[PDB]
């Protein structure tokens, strides 16, 4: 189908308590496959999905080498920003960074993105053209200045156009049996008494992959998703996902209903009734 390789960095200041934490994680689509904590003894970047491990030891050293610089570079960035804003060095503040690429069905390469937030608010971002920067406030414009004088967008563009899409390609071959196989949800619908007068009527879909899914609830043929409570999809632990959608209904009227689960691995969408 379509796929994406992304990396997610986080830097948190712990005032008085030594260095800031720098976590880093890698994703191919919805499956995590790499991590790095700066709270780790002799800390290296450990695999987190099985299909990655047969990459040469050169890789892993070259990455924890890069991860260690990013933690260093960021802990200074925390400092730089805190003074752009004149906040107290006792405050806890967080700097987040994200980058990656989306490639199409043939490997088209659809979008490259690279974005940075400070304390959860947009800070500066690479634009869709991979050559300009959106800068949120007057502090981020100083960063934008620095990064325009160094050709920073050009380094990133060639990372996101080449290294990204190439290594993505490599990753999905390695995990061909894991990542390229969708997993149809287990459907089922339970019924939970509330009273003499009405009853919760849950629609479950368990164990699916990837995470995207739609559940829909149809009264008498209507589309009654207006009243339904849908929790947000949640990880199952085994690397698959779950979500459910309930309704509340006059007694007897359970047979009035339908739940409909649409999902990439369902050959044709399934509908079910009590």
């Amino acid at each position: 189908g379509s796929h994406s390789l992304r990396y997610f960095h986080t830097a948190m200041s712990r005032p008085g308590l030594g260095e800031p934490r720098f976590i880093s994680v890698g994703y191919v689509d919805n499956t995590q496959f790499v991590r790095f904590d700066s709270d780790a003894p002799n800390p290296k970047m450990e695999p987190r999905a099985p299909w990655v491990e047969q990459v040469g030891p050169e890789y892993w050293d070259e990455e924890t080498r890069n991860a260690k610089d990013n933690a260093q570079n960021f802990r200074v960035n925390l400092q730089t920003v805190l003074r752009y804003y004149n906040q107290s060095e006792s405050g806890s503040h967080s700097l987040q960074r994200m980058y990656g690429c989306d490639v199409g069905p043939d490997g088209c390469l659809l979008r490259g993105y690279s974005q940075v937030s400070y304390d959860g608010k947009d800070y500066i971002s690479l634009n869709k053209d991979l050559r300009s920067w959106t800068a949120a406030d007057t502090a981020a414009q100083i960063t934008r200045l620095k990064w325009e004088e160094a050709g920073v967008a050009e380094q990133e563009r060639n990372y996101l156009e080449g290294t990204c899409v190439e290594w993505l390609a490599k990753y999905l071959d390695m995990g061909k049996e894991t990542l390229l196989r969708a997993e149809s949800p287990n459907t089922r619908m339970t019924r939970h008494p509330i009273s003499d007068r009405e009853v919760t009527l849950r629609c479950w879909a368990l164990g699916f992959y990837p995470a995207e899914i739609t559940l829909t609830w149809q009264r008498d043929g209507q589309d009654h998703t207006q009243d339904a409570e849908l929790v947000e999809t949640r990880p199952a632990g085994d690397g698959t996902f779950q979500k459910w959608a309930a309704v509340v209904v006059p007694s007897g009227e359970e047979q009035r209903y339908t739940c409909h689960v649409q999902h990439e691995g369902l050959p044709e969408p399934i509908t079910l009734r009590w």
């Binding site: 880093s24 990455e63 890069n66 991860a67 570079n73 200074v76 730089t80 290294t163 990204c164």
Partner: peptide, 9 residues
Amino acid sequence: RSFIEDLLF
């Protein structure tokens, strides 16, 4: 693979 970035603010 990660992006090698001497990226300071």
